[PDB]
Amino acid sequence: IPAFHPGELNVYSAPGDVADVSRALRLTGRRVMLVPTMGALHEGHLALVRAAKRVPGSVVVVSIFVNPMQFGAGGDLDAYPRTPDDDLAQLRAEGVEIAFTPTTAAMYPDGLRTTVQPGPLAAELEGGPRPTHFAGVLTVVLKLLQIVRPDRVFFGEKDYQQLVLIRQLVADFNLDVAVVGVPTVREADGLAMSSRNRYLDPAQRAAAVALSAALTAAAHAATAGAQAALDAARAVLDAAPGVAVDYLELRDIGLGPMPLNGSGRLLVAARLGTTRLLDNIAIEIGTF
Amino acid sequence: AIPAFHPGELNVYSAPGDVADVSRALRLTGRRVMLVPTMGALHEGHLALVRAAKRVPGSVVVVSIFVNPPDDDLAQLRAEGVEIAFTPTTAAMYPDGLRTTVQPGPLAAELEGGPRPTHFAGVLTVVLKLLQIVRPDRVFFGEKDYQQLVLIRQLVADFNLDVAVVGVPTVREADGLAMSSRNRYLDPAQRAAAVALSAALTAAAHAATAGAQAALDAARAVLDAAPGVAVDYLELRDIGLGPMPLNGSGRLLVAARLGTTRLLDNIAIEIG
Ligand SMILES: O=C(O)c1cc2ccccc2o1
Ligand SMILES: O=C(O)c1cc2ccccc2o1
Ligand SMILES: COc1ccc2[nH]ccc2c1
Ligand SMILES: COc1ccc2[nH]ccc2c1
């Protein structure tokens, strides 16, 4: 155990340090909450922190680590926004008590050796053109879960496929953690919070409202059935200047090998210039 | 509510949740939870793992019995003073089928991974799951399956698992044959010839004062003196199964087929 000053932000880089402090805290009866992040924190991340904070007796651990294993070449890894000064300041302001900021060397001292192989869901949607992306995500999350051993781990719904795959990891490896999905935080016009929003110029920012407009239109059209919901979303996206749709799919809530019934999830990914944006929404078919 | 647990008796659980709940409750009372994973059909090798686990002060011993895709086994464990047997069904372990799995590093494609390219992914997946269900302080494996032991140490290091891996020296028959459930399948000619695996390895370990090549040559000579022993490999590696260093500690591993029965053995080697 290194030092832990309660009511203050404690930053640990060494996996051993945060593991020691976490273990000590849990033994004195605190419930450890984990919010895994890649930094560049926005209000979406702060909603996760606040949800964690609400759990009685909680101590909140926010990890910040840009994980090289979930990026493919070139390219993307070097381009990910890094603003540690802002991040830690936001955490102090939220009364978070632990930030965990490991090095690449500490996380991957043996490179990529044992890794997590996701189920078939990882090959679809976001995984289609990026066949190793979710192996990278699940490997890092497993490691963070083992280092920190939290009672609960918090993820946004914005990256819905990621959230589902993390629930699969937790179930499939019998991890003793509760996965908490938090509803997507949105700008006033509906745009989903994302660290990628900073790459939209004023015009693209304006056009980008079409993703959330298309989704909310579909959710309401859905009383009239799946075809109507999908066609409403498509119509809104088609009305949008220089939104280039990658996919728009209505799936079961688990995204998996089961047909859509009364409850589903509508997912969209689209490019605005070079910026790729995701959003999704709960859909009830035939329900007003 | 924590499931029933009677100290000093064999408590048998089939539900992962029950053993998970009991192990957590026990660990909170100042017991150190020891895990001995097995595939049942227990022999003296497995009992050596149990005995090693038992001698840890404050230990409660969990033996899992699961065939990765009985009453005799439980009596043996009872006779050893083991307090928890974990006997899950396949459906209990894989309620959602094979979905998320462990992908081993490149060592898994070598040696035993030649004939069985996906064997170790299966093993590491089930071992990770048992570690997560039981959350033992220490987990015990025989050295006989050395490559498996090394891959488990890589699993533990790579995924930041909070468990100590304990390798237990191989239990042997009187003539040196490494214990294995497969031994019973050997006819008398085969069982007599099978002694060449251990004899080759012990000869190598002693020849090793004269260097790496002398050790390998001594082992090959011994295997060459046996009939009906088809050697699949004979390899000297470092202790982590990387390339052998020019001097220092290593491990010599052999695998051979006698009729339809594949046998394995390995030994510590000190070079020079
Ligand atoms: O900042 C994020 O959106 C984020 C961070 C993070 C860390 C591990 C796994 C998934 C993750 O998503
Ligand atoms: O009985 C054994 O030799 C045995 C059991 C077992 C269970 C999980 C992983 C490896 C294993 O080896
Ligand atoms: C809870 O609302 C959100 C929205 C977008 C997000 N991106 C990463 C986390 C996150 C959370
Ligand atoms: C401790 O010695 C041994 C020898 C052979 C074995 N087979 C399975 C476990 C085991 C243990």
Which residues of A are tagged catalytic? 45
Q: How far apart are CA A60 and CA A49, in angstroms?
A: 7
Instruction: Look at residue A132 and give its three-state secondary structure.
Output: coil
- CA of B182, nearest ligand number: 4
- Across the interface, whether the CB atoms of B154 and A113 are under 8 A apart is answered yes
Cα within 13 Å of Cα(A268), Cβ side: 30
Asked if B118 has any chain A CB less than 8 Å from its own CB, the reply is: no
Alpha-carbon gap, residue A167 to B73, rounded angstroms: 35
Order across the sheet with B32-38: list the strands.
Answer: B11-13, B84-86, B59-65, B32-38, B138-142, B164-168
Nearest by Cα to A150 from A61, A263, A86: A61
Of A117, A135, A142, the CB nearest to B159: A142
Residues in Cβ contact with B192 at an 8 Å cutoff, skipping those fewer than 6 apart: none
- A141 Cβ below 6 A of ligand 1: yes
- Is B179 within any annotated ligand binding site? yes
- Measured CA to CA, the distance from residue A152 to residue A180 in angstroms comes to 7
- Check if B154 contacts A (Cβ < 8 Å): yes
Whether residue A188 contacts residue A195, with contact meaning beta carbons closer than 8 Å, is answered with: no
Chain A residues in contact with B104 by the CB 8 A cut-off are 114
Q: Does ligand 1 come within 6 angstroms of the Cβ of A193?
A: no
Reduced to 3 states (helix: H, G, I; strand: E, B; else coil), residue A182 is strand
| All residues at 6 or more sequence positions from B174 whose CB lies less than 8 Å from its CB, including other chains | none
Three-state DSSP class for residue A278: strand
d(CA A30, CA A60): 10
Q: Contact at 8 Å (CB) between A118 and A138?
A: yes
Q: What is the greatest pairwise CA distance in chain B? A: 63
| Residue partners of A85: CB distance under 8 A and separation at least 6 | none
How far does the centroid of ligand 3 lie from the alpha carbon of residue B196, in Å?
A: 63
Give chain B's domains with CATH numbers.
1-169 (3.40.50.620), 170-272 (3.30.1300.10)
Please compute Rg for chain B using Cα positions: 20
Nearest to B124 by CA among B146, B149, B145, B89: B149
Helix-helix angle B16-28:B119-134, to 10 degrees: 50
Handedness of CA B239, B243, B249, B253 (dihedral sign): positive
* Interchain pair B103, A135: CB under 8 A: yes
A245 vs B138: CA distance, rounded Å: 52
Contact between chains at B20 and A142 (C-beta distance less than 8 A): no
Q: Is the dihedral of CA A103, A106, A110, A115 positive or negative?
A: negative
How far, in Å, is the centroid of ligand 3 from the Cα of A90? 15
Q: Decide if B85 touches A, using CB distance below 8 A.
A: no
Report the residue numbers after which chain B has a gap, meaning the C atom sits over 2.5 angstroms from the next written residue's N, or none. Answer: 69
Name the one residue in this structure whose structure tokens are 């006989």.
Answer: B144
Q: Annotate chain B with DSSP letters as a single string.
A: -PPP--TTS-EEE-SHHHHHHHHHHHHHTT-EEEEEEE-SS--HHHHHHHHHHHTSTTEEEEEEE-----HHHHHHHHHTT--EEE---HHHH-TT-S-SEEE--GGGGSGGGTT-TTHHHHHHHHHHHHHHHH--SEEEEESTTHHHHHHHHHHHHHTT---EEEEEPPPB-TTSPBP-GGGGG--HHHHHHTHHHHHHHHHHHHHGGG-HHHHHHHHHHHHHTSTT-EEEEEEEE-TTSSBPPSSEEEEEEEEEEETTEEEEEEEEEEE-
A109 alpha carbon to ligand 2 midpoint, in Å?
28
Say whether residue B260 is in contact with chain A using an 8 A CB cutoff: no
